Design goal:
The structure is a homodimer. With about 70 residues, chain A is α+β, with helices and mostly antiparallel strands. Chain A has one domain (about 1-70). Chain A is about 25% helix and about 10% strand. Chain A has two helices and one strand. Chain A has helices at about 15-20, 25-35; one strand at about 5-10. The first copy, chain A, is flat and about 55 Å long. The interface of A and B includes residues 3, 18, 23, 35 and 59 of A. It is classed as dna binding protein. The entry lists the keywords ribbon-helix-helix, DNA binding protein. It forms a dimeric assembly. The entry is titled "Solution structure of the bacterial antitoxin CcdA: Implications for DNA and toxin binding". Chains A, B: CcdA.
């Protein structure tokens, strides 16, 4: 069978991601796999932060691109 | 008005999170806000499946506690 899990966004941030990469629906269940794997009843944290992205800072920014071709 | 993002999981990991924390739908859009600001998603889904969490016995179930638990 299947389970329809739907977060009615438009107001929530979902739109932002899909607004620039409407490839999250799958992500939804993916973001869980991570929170799922790590899921094991007991879970600590307190304070975690080291490297941020790598071990200094990298990432790549092109500027400001939406995600639509529009009409022309 | 609103946008219905429906990731019919049941098979996907979504269920894994709701199975032990059915507090993701709203979360979905949250994970986006972070992936929205930073707008730097990633591509790395699953490869194959297992089809056996353990190996002993696990016939059709209806539920009892949490969502898919037994006792503790």
């Amino acid at each position: 069978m299947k389970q329809r899990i739907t977060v009615t966004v438009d107001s929530d941030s979902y739109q932002l991601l899909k607004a620039y990469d409407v490839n999250i629906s799958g992500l939804v269940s993916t973001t869980m796999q991570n929170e799922a794997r790590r899921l094991r009843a007991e879970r600590w944290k307190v304070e975690n932060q080291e490297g941020m992205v790598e071990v200094a800072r990298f990432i790549e920014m092109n500027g400001s691109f939406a995600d639509e071709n529009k009409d022309w």
